[PDB]
Amino acid sequence: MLIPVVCFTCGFPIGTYAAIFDKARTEYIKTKMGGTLPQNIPLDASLQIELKDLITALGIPMRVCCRTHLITTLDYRKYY
Amino acid sequence: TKVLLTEILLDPMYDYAATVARIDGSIPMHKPRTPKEAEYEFKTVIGRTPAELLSQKEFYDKIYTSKYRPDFTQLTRRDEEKTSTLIYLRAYELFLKYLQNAPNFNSELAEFKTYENAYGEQKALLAQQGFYNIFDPNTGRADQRTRLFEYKRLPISTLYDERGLPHKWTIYVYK
Amino acid sequence: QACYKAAEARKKGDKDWEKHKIPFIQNTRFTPQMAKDILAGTLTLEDLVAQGICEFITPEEA
Amino acid sequence: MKICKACSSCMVRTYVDGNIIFRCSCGESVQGDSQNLLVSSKVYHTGEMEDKYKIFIKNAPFDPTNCQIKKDCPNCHLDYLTQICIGSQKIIILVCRCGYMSNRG
Amino acid sequence: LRPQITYGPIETVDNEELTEADMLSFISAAVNSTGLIGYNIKSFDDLMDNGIPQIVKQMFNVDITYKDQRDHTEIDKLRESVQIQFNFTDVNIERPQHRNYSQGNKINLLPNKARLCGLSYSGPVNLAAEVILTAHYSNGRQEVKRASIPPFQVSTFPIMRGSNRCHTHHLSKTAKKEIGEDPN
Ligand SMILES: [Zn+2]
Ligand SMILES: [Zn+2]
Ligand SMILES: [Zn+2]
Known part of the structure; x- marks a missing residue:
């Protein structure tokens, strides 16, 4: 229902940088969104939203599993 | 009294009114542990004692009504959390009006539905993981290069020789 | 009409009769700007139908 | 069949002494002269006869779902024709909107 | 009537820049206009507002005749059948x-x-x-008695959730969420 406290694969403390990663990401999207309705963001076909540098600035390493779970985890608060 | 309490305690309307009463502190945040606390919660939420609910005839006329009456005319578009609070409070007030068949209801319902649709657009903005498109470097947009089959009429010399016979590629040449 | 004019020119003994032909062009009226307008919420399917861009097709009409 | 003059009913055909005699339920009796000497008939390969596809072959140049071919029409000199393949022997017919139709028909 | 509208020539349409990912907007528009189960709600709505009233008011007119199986009386012995005729308004x-x-x-x-x-x-x-x-x-004569009956409740008809006759139709998304319903 939230970003996990630790990475499901290895157990790196993803959760302690989770909340920040959420909120900051939003402004980044607001920077790159562009004349488009929010619910149509995953259909724009012209977006280049990259979160590599944000996660790097968070101090999280370049592990595939950790960044996968940080980026892809759904939040229950945002759908209910 | 027992049947009335069992019916009303299982009504989602009662739970929603109780939540609204809990928000501003009219009833304790914890669910009742003793029958006296349950009776007090019933009196505060429904507005009538279960004994006197069976005597008189209405039911919806005196259900809790939130204490803070914010200004919902700022719902006409520290601001965003206040907007969320206004959305919640107006949803409760409009639901209570719907229960009571209040006059001038459909237009206000439509107006608040438009307001909540705008709020939902904002919430969906808050709920985006992001999106990426692998751009073709030669172009400036989504890659169109594919490894699909493309038809091409090969010369007839590939299938037949100069004497009209078909080719039989069956000799392997190794260097 | 270009084919008819090209044939009519050839029947008159003209040499450059092929110059009266025009290439065939078939295309849809859906432009990339329309795609960006759909995503912005300012272009729906109802007014794409109203502009003669798309139409509803039924299996026996298909 | 023979239709009774009197009551316009379907008369019953029988055969007497080398002649076809139609007798009706109203008592009217007539004898056919020449056009009633057809006891029965059958036509084979009804699924690929030319009378089957007359309407379809006529409408083929205007149907947009038919296969076209890059050949010149000898009548209007249009550079494309409509190619159809009908029958179990796969008879190929080229048709055009001007009325041209291969097989000379 | 003959058509009169005309569109721009097809040679001036610029679609060389389109991509397959751009055509997903067409599917998005089609789904947004259609919805996903909007036909179910529309079908139940025109069953409620238009279907059942028409069926009751048109296809359920009752005209029957029954034998008079009573005993002996001046009027009784002299009459044989009663015609029951009624319709719903x-x-x-x-x-x-x-x-x-x-x-x-x-x-x-x-x-x-x-x-x-x-x-x-x-x-x-x-x-x-x-x-x-x-x-x-x-x-040979007959007697006719006519009576108009005030409207009354006969039974209850099942109601599709989310339709026009559902309570979760005059409520906002927050109210739907908080009354134990699924807001999405
Ligand atoms: Zn990990
Ligand atoms: Zn006759
Ligand atoms: Zn022709």
């Missing part, structure tokens, strides 16, 4: 209602209460009618 269906405590006034029944209590999410059906009874005598 006014038809409507309301939102689901439930009786709180006993002998109340039919408060609203929310879908979650119906799910929890095992109740039926059915709305009342009210019908009105006029009835004509014709009795036939042996001699």
